[PDB]
């Protein structure tokens, strides 16, 4: 009653594994070169996306 | 030391923590009706899938 | 080795830990407001979506 | 197998550790922006969401 | 607190583990069916880009 | 108690074990080939990335 419950997400880790799961990152990482400029023009943003951080901000580990 | 790090994941569950976050499950949920039905279309892959499936059949877990 | 492990996924969190990654969360929540709606209208799928699920039911850690 | 599962997961972590990775999930949080402000509408949103929410409310951590 | 932080964990999982959210995970990987066939058919890119691939290849953990 | 919060996690990787899940995966990565190449042509920044980067360089798994 013990390796049998952390061994088993032991196997999903297998499962991605890093030859055609890591190319998925990779290139997904490369598409948003395009997209990436475009979301970088954006103006009236100074502190108003930082009211709603505001309430993750405190953050509690004993949530 | 053994504390500290596990209460750090904890925080990270506290962020999750929000109405508005367990309301995107549902929308989700609901919305792939629709796509369903056209996903159960048996067109050409009959077997052509399982032998992928092979592959991700034996769910190694040595990685 | 030991803590050479957990610490590791400590890391992990404080990648997190960014209004950035925060923002993104709260604001895919929003966008499936429109979604919502026309998952809601349907009328379908009575019986049929249950029987997949009575082979989910039973759940089983022992996998 | 003792220190040998836990060490797994930490090999996953090294492999999100990334250059072009890294780059993605920002980009993608303040993109978002626009897609907020249609989410705000809300039309005929008032509370009658919210009962399909009762369902998720109780949560329940003894799954 | 030791039984409080994994704890917090758990109620994530029983909040994954649903009804509504178990149909989502089937209709999604029937809806790419379709969508995996056209992925088939690609030109080039059969040894070129794994080298790149390579790097990443040897993998680490020692994040 | 001690074996439970664990074992919660263990019934999610069950929901994983899935042939129709392992389709997912592969179908996605077979799809980005073609996002690839256009990602690669773009302009060319080279210090647009590392400034964003480089505050997460120093890291601090202290968080």
Known sequence: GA???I???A???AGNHGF???L???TLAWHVKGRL???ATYLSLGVWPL???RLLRPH???A
Do not use: H
């Open 3 to 5: 390796k049998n419950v």
């Open 7 to 9: 061994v088993l997400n």
């Open 11 to 13: 196997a999903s880790a």
């Open 20 to 22: 055609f799961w890591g």
């Open 24 to 26: 998925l990152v990779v």
């Open 37 to 39: 400029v475009p979301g």
């Open 51 to 53: 009211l709603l951080v």
């Open 60 to 62: 509690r580990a004993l």
